[PDB]
Design an enzyme around this catalytic site. Structure first.
Site, PDB file in Angstrom:
ATOM      1  CG  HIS A 469      -0.424   0.271   2.491  1.00  0.00           C
ATOM      2  ND1 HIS A 469      -0.158  -0.732   3.396  1.00  0.00           N
ATOM      3  CD2 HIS A 469      -0.019   1.423   3.077  1.00  0.00           C
ATOM      4  CE1 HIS A 469       0.386  -0.213   4.481  1.00  0.00           C
ATOM      5  NE2 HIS A 469       0.479   1.094   4.316  1.00  0.00           N
ATOM      6  CG  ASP A 519      -0.683  -3.976   2.384  1.00  0.00           C
ATOM      7  OD1 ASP A 519      -0.046  -3.527   1.400  1.00  0.00           O
ATOM      8  OD2 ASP A 519      -0.883  -3.297   3.430  1.00  0.00           O
ATOM      9  CB  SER A 642       2.584   2.166   7.392  1.00  0.00           C
ATOM     10  OG  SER A 642       1.703   1.338   6.676  1.00  0.00           O
TER      11      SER A 642
END
Ligand SMILES: *[C@@H]1O[C@H](CO)[C@@H](O[C@@H]2O[C@H](CO)[C@@H](O[C@@H]3O[C@H](CO[C@H]4O[C@H](CO[C@H]5O[C@H](CO)[C@@H](O)[C@H](O)[C@@H]5O)[C@@H](O)[C@H](O[C@H]5O[C@H](CO)[C@@H](O)[C@H](O)[C@@H]5O)[C@@H]4O)[C@@H](O)[C@H](O[C@H]4O[C@H](CO)[C@@H](O)[C@H](O)[C@@H]4O)[C@@H]3O)[C@H](O)[C@H]2NC(C)=O)[C@H](O)[C@H]1NC(C)=O
Ligand SMILES: *[C@@H]1O[C@H](CO)[C@@H](O[C@@H]2O[C@H](CO)[C@@H](O)[C@H](O)[C@H]2NC(C)=O)[C@H](O)[C@H]1NC(C)=O
Ligand SMILES: *[C@@H]1O[C@H](CO)[C@@H](O)[C@H](O)[C@H]1NC(C)=O
Ligand SMILES: *[C@@H]1O[C@H](CO)[C@@H](O)[C@H](O)[C@H]1NC(C)=O
Length: 710
Positions: A469, A519, A642
């Site tokens: 992502h 992901d 992240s």
């Protein structure tokens, strides 16, 4: 004898473990918290556990895990420190400053660490006017004596409840140095990590070149391995201790020296298994076989050391004064019966002619090391026996036999190549990238818009593993940069490989704006990485590397690894978070047992997911779940973290089990602000055990030794 009901003994925000066949317990708290008011409880003859008492002996109704505090300095001579607070929270910073006329040594800036110790070294303000240097006042201690003339002494004292480690008295010696070793105050919750112990022991035992053990020319060394088997160290015929010692012997042999070994186990009486005077006692492989064969079966330490004395003693033989002697004692109690063993150490120093001549003190010829294990060890007594040498540590306290084993596994891992996955040496002067050498920073530039900043992990010399992502199809490779090791240089990439099942756009027509299934992505770098102390690979699931990291046999399967790493429990894990260029480890718990469902259901609270009828449409079998208040108050990931690794720290090694993917709510810095962190604040991570066929394929030329991935 009789057992005690566990009704009512729970600790708020923590857990406990049973010791001594249910006769004692120890409380266990998450990282940065400690058990209040007491570390342990004993089962009483009434059926009830021992009462919860403070220092002043005020009854506490309920046990709690409380935030760790670092102690305030009692005093600071010839200078001032600030800010001045009653106590300090984890990550509080102070600084030390000398008065005019004085010069600072030690650490000017100090930070309260997660273990309740201040970082760096004791700050000292000194004007160079004494026969000896100003000895300083380690934070937590109180010093008596302020004159530093030749033959003056200073004494040190801890606060009620704490125990002094190191020298209670230091004396100013001819030549300008202090006898003994710098003291410190140990609270009941404090343990030494195996990585700390491995660096402290090795740098005591050896000199640095690689490392070496130096003996006299035509010089000898004797090593006495003494095991107190009176409590739990004798469990399963000393299985744990044998692992430790096999590894110690192997490490010592790496230095090319051939020491003679003695081996003694003891409780009420001592047993000599190997005697130093034996023809074969310098055969490391023979000694190893003898040790592996030992078995079991009050604590009579004096007698154990008298067995050691008798091995030493002898009018005297040639080269008696050329031999250095190392005593290593392992114990989980050391509550001595039958007299103070200290007098035997005194007898030994008479024998070896140590401390008998001011022009030749011969302290180099004896070292006593004590490894204490568990919460029940007598701290006064393990310190009393251990050598006290300047800038050296000879007394250790680890949590566990498992942790003691980890000390010696770490020492064995030290000399291995930098390619050794998920190994971190405890460098004394290391920075953030010495402590998380696998950490990668990813930047993506996007015109007229905010740049992407994500994290990743080095997994091989060509590959960084991160989240998908962080990138779209529109991102050209020149817009994507990677930095490792805390270097200004940002590295050029070759390509980004997305998991072939990844599609953020779903599922969009089904009313779901973001779909994070699969992901994961690999960044292939243009150039090969050179590994170093600040750039090293993390271990991946289901490889030969991880089998070895876990100390398992070569036939070990991927299902066996999953069982070891992700059992059906609340799994202690960590991620790395960046706050103002600093990297800190944040411990979290993966809800992989009965709590999984309730963690997963909290996804409905995520923005965009509020209309989702069936939560499994967004939370797939690819996902791991952390966060929430149960069992513990978990910290949450920041926007910047992240794509970073979710990591299990097991057997002194770091294994990546997950990739940081998405979160229910941004609640990051309610940390040092409060908080008000909602109970539905969960983080979802991609489980790497769920994408192994893709990983194994992409990384097939990277020499990682993947196992069966189907
Ligand atoms: C160093 O770190 C510590 C730890 O983080 C930090 O201490 C906090 O400091 C803040 C601000 O000073 C305190 O906030 C105050 O809270 C007062 C209410 O306190 C009671 O209720 C708390 C909330 O409990 C709920 O949530 C918790 C956790 O989620 C949960 O455990 C509970 O079950 C409950 O659901 C509770 O945490 C707190 O408990 C602590 O203190 C008691 C002592 O009575 C002790 O028994 C516990 O062991 C525990 O340590 C307590 O029961 C509230 O009155 C107050 O409101 C004031 O506003 C201002 C000051 O802000 C004043 O004008 C006036 O005093 C008002 O009353 C304020 O909101 C918080 O309590 C601390 N948290 C602790 C100690 O855990 C320090 O700030 C950090 N900094 C330094 C350098 O010290
Ligand atoms: C103690 O910390 C201070 C404040 O952080 C340090 O001073 C700064 O150091 C950084 C990095 O070297 C510089 O970029 C700044 O110019 C300094 N700013 C100041 C003077 O506030 C200081 O170096 C530290 N002291 C030590 C380690 O001795
Ligand atoms: C220890 O080994 C001996 C063999 O000499 C044996 O009697 C005993 O079963 C063992 N004890 C264990 C494994 O608890
Ligand atoms: C050991 O003792 C002998 C005899 O006193 C001496 O010649 C030798 O130098 C000594 N070794 C030392 C100083 O360690």
């Amino acid at each position: 004898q009789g057992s005690c009901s566990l009704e009512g003994v729970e600790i708020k925000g923590g857990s406990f473990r049973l010791l001594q066949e249910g006769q004692a317990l120890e409380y266990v708290c998450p990282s940065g918290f400690y058990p209040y008011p007491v570390q342990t409880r004993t089962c009483r003859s009434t059926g009830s556990w021992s009462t919860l008492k403070t220092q002043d002996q005020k009854t506490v109704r309920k046990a709690e895990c409380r935030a760790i505090h670092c102690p305030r300095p009692h005093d600071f001579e010839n200078g001032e420190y600030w800010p001045r607070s009653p106590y300090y929270n984890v990550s509080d910073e102070i600084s030390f400053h000398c008065y005019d006329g004085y010069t600072l040594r030690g650490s000017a800036n100090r930070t309260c660490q997660v273990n309740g110790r201040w970082s760096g070294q004791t700050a000292i303000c000194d004007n160079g006017a004494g026969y000896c240097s100003n000895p300083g006042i380690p934070i937590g201690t109180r010093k008596v004596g302020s004159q530093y003339r030749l033959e003056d002494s200073v004494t040190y004292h801890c606060s009620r409840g704490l125990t002094l480690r190191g020298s209670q008295r230091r004396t100013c010696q001819e030549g300008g140095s202090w006898s003994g070793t710098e003291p410190s105050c140990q609270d009941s919750f404090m343990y030494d990590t195996p990585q700390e112990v491995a660096e402290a022991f090795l740098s005591s035992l050896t000199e640095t070149i690689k490392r070496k053990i130096v003996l006299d020319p035509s010089g000898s060394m004797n090593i006495y391995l003494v095991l107190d088997g009176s409590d739990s160290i004798g469990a399963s015929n000393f299985t744990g201790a044998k692992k430790c010692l096999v590894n110690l012997i192997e490490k010592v042999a790496s230095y090319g020296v051939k020491p003679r070994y003695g081996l003694v186990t003891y409780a009420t009486y001592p047993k000599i298994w190997v005697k130093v005077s034996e023809a074969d006692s310098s055969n490391a492989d023979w000694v190893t076989k003898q040790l592996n064969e030992i078995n079991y079966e009050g604590t009579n330490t004096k007698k154990a050391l008298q067995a050691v004395y008798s091995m030493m003693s002898w009018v005297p033989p040639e080269g008696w004064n050329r031999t250095r002697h190392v005593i290593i004692l392992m114990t989980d109690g050391l509550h001595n019966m039958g007299g103070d063993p200290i007098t035997v150490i005194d007898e030994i120093r008479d024998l070896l002619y140590i401390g008998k001549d001011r022009k030749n003190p011969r302290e180099d010829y004896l070292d006593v090391y004590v490894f204490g294990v568990g919460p029940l060890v007598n701290q006064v007594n393990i310190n009393a026996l251990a050598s006290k040498k300047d800038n050296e540590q000879h007394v250790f306290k680890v949590k566990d036999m498992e942790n003691l084993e980890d000390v010696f596994y770490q020492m064995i891992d030290e000399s291995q190549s930098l390619s050794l996955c998920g190994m971190v040496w405890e460098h004394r002067k290391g920075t953030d990238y010495h402590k998380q050498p696998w950490q990668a920073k990813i930047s993506v530039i996007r015109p007229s818009k905010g740049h992407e900043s994500c994290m990743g992990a080095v997994v091989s010399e060509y590959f960084v593993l991160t989240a998908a992502h962080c990138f779209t199809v529109d991102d050209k490779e020149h817009s994507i940069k990677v930095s490792v090791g805390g270097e200004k240089r940002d590295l050029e990439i070759e390509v980004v490989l997305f998991h072939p099942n990844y599609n953020i756009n779903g599922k969009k027509e089904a009313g779901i704006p973001e779909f994070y299934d699969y992901d994961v992505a690999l960044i292939k770098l243009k150039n090969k990485l050179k590994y170093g102390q600040t750039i090293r690979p993390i271990c991946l699931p289901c490889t030969e590397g991880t089998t070895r990291a876990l100390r398992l046999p070569p036939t070990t399967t991927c299902q066996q690894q999953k069982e070891e790493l992700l059992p059906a429990q609340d799994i202690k894990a960590l991620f790395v978070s960046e706050e103002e260029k600093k990297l800190t480890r944040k411990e979290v718990y993966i809800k992989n047992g009965d709590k999984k469902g309730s963690c997963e259901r909290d996804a409905q609270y995520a923005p965009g997911y509020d209309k989702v009828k069936d939560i499994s449409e967004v939370v797939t079998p690819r996902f791991l779940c952390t966060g929430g208040v149960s069992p513990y108050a978990d910290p949450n990931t920041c926007r910047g973290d992240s794509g970073g690794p979710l990591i299990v720290h097991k057997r002194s090694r770091f294994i990546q089990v997950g990739v940081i993917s998405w979160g229910v709510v941004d609640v990051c810095k309610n940390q040092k602000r409060q908080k008000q962190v909602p109970a539905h604040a969960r983080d979802f991570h991609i489980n790497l055990f769920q994408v192994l066929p893709w990983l194994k394929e992409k990384l097939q030329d990277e020499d990682l030794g993947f196992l069966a991935a189907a």
